């Protein structure tokens with residue numbers, strides 16, 4: 177029941193790894209969209 | 216999404232697919248917050264460790280989608296980017312602090328039964344909902360497991376985790392601009408976001424006004440669906456002041 | 467632009483029709499610090 181996130185505004189060796197593909201998986205099986213959009 | 220299920224039609228009308236023009240690829244999840252403003256993670260457009268740096272002309276946004284792969288004509292719509300706004304204090308070097316970016320579309324998107332924006336939380340709504348144990352909803356087309364890819368959009372409900380538990384779960388420095396979510400081993404159930412889901416929305420339904428608010432952005436994790444590890448989400452509400460400075464200046 | 471657009475968070479195929487999705491009950495029923 178504790179606040180998992182503070183309720184204020186951001187008045188302004190180990191690296192986090194984003195949940196982002198790295199080995200080209202985002203192109204698997206993708207059906208080509210109309211060429212008019214590709215410009 | 217690990218341990219999710221198939222989304223229902225129109226269950227997530229704010230889900231956007233950030234899409235690479237050439238090669239045609241899925242880049243990231245994203246969320247629709249207005250007629251021409253899409254929220255995503257900053258590392259989807261700028262991640263130097265992997266030499267990622269996309270400009271507005273490289274990318275498109277596909278709104279209203281369900282299938283990951285099929286071009287869904289007459290239902291999905293595809294918009295172009297006018298400008299990208301990455302948080303000025305986004306730090307990719309250590310812990311993806313302020314992992315957030317905005318994309319303004321060239322032309323306002325037409326809403327439908329499958330294209331609809333999500334709300335951003337006010338101080339009152341955020342305070343009552345961002346509490347450990349309360350469950351939000353994560354959506355994406357990413358990996359179904361860490362150790363392959365769904366045919367349609369995936370949804371999983373995950374609980375907010377206490378900050379002390381998030382801090383102790385990893386050696387990486389946690390900041391106040393992120394929270395973590397997922398089940399503990401004692402809780403039995405499973406679920407997580409995974410690579411390909413980042414930039415997508417963590418949303419919560421308000422018991423006050425029946426609206427959906429986006430509380431988080433899929434940012435990072437250590438593997439997917441690991442006992443004692445949790446996925447980390449950009450804390451949208453802490454950054455909401457910046458989000459508004461961009462939509463009021465350049466709106 | 468505070469919380470967003472006037473119609474935000476209300477889905478055409480659910481809230482605008484008074485229909486629930488299949489798992490949204492699980493979300494509401496977690497709103498209990500127990």
Ligand SMILES: *[C@@H]1O[C@H](CO)[C@@H](O)[C@H](O)[C@H]1NC(C)=O
Pocket residue numbers: 263268270
């Ligand atoms: C990303 O690319 C743009 C070119 O449009 C460049 O001006 C900018 O400095 C780059 N940012 C990096 C490499 O961090």
Ligand code: NA
Pocket residue numbers: 397398407440441442443444445
């Ligand atoms: Na886990």
